[PDB]
Amino acid sequence: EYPTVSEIPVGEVRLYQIADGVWSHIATQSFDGAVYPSNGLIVRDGDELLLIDTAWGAKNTAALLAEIEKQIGLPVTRAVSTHFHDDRVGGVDVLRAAGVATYASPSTRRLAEVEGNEIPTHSLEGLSSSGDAVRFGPVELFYPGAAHSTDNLVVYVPSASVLYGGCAIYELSRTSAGNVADADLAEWPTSIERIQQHYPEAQFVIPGHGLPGGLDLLKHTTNVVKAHTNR
Ligand code: NA
Ligand SMILES: [Zn+2]
Ligand SMILES: [Zn+2]
Ligand SMILES: [Zn+2]
User: Fold this and answer.
1) Transmembrane segments in this chain: where (predicted)?
2) Which long-range contacts (CB under 8 A, 24 or more apart) does 7-14 make?
3) Catalytic-labelled residue, pool 45, 53, 87, 151
4) CA nearest to 51, candidates 70, 32, 11, 23
5) Strands 34-45 vs 132-136: parallel, antiparallel or unpaired
6) Residues 66, 53: Cα–Cα separation, whole Å
7) Is 228 labelled as part of a ligand binding site?
8) Which of 103, 176, 193, 203 has the fewest C-beta atoms lying within 10 Å of its C-beta?
9) Ligand 2 center to residue 109 CA distance, Å?
């Protein structure tokens, strides 16, 4: 029942309820003549919402805000981007113009600026060292170490046992490396083990792209990363 890359035209966004007050958002983009899905998260925060990641571009992100107001009807007051790539920050300008306070680590803000990408306004402190965690409203933010990117964060929703791995975690159907231009392949397995150690009770694990599953997605990602390392 999770929407697949094939059922979502580029420009539209779907919401999927994972648990009480926790949704993923799913959008698509075309690259090199193929179509790719991308996930983010929405977490209820009293009578407001916390958004995790944009919907991969300005147009998709405007559609995301429209779909949230239609389906949920609570204001998105804050957004966190989990690393500096466009599937995470592309759409930050749309969020900002809509009155959403945008956040990322100082590492992410720096890398976004270097890349010429959109830059979240606010800096998240306390996430500079591997293993660092901070509470941000209804979620915990965790910096596991370098993996898919040097700045990648993961997000845990303790009330729902939902772990949002972002692009540091691959879906099961992905058996080859994705975009690894900015990755730390040498550290990625160690960073994954920090995630496993910190969130062993997670019941629902969401990758940056593709289908959710359980904690098996972590060892799966390590397997794929190690195979790529040995290519
Ligand atoms: Na924790
Ligand atoms: Zn990325
Ligand atoms: Zn502000
Ligand atoms: Zn990604």
Assistant:
1) none
2) 8/37, 10/35, 10/60, 11/59, 11/60, 11/63, 12/60, 12/63, 13/55, 13/60, 13/63, 13/64, 13/67, 14/67
3) 87
4) 23
5) unpaired
6) 16
7) no
8) 176
9) 14
CATH of 1-231, one of 3.30.70.100, 3.40.50.2300, 2.30.40.10, 3.60.15.10: 3.60.15.10
Alpha carbon distance 121, 143 (integer Å): 19
- Is position 148 annotated as part of the catalytic site? yes
- 77 Cα to the center of ligand 4, angstroms: 23
Experimental technique: X-ray
Q: Which residue has the tokens 């919402």?
A: 49
Residue type, 209: H
228 is catalytic: no
Q: What's the resolution in A?
A: 1.3
Report which bound ligand comes closest to the CA of 158: 1
Measured in Å, residue 114 CA sits from the centre of ligand 1 at 31
39 has catalytic annotation: no
Annotated catalytic residue 25: no
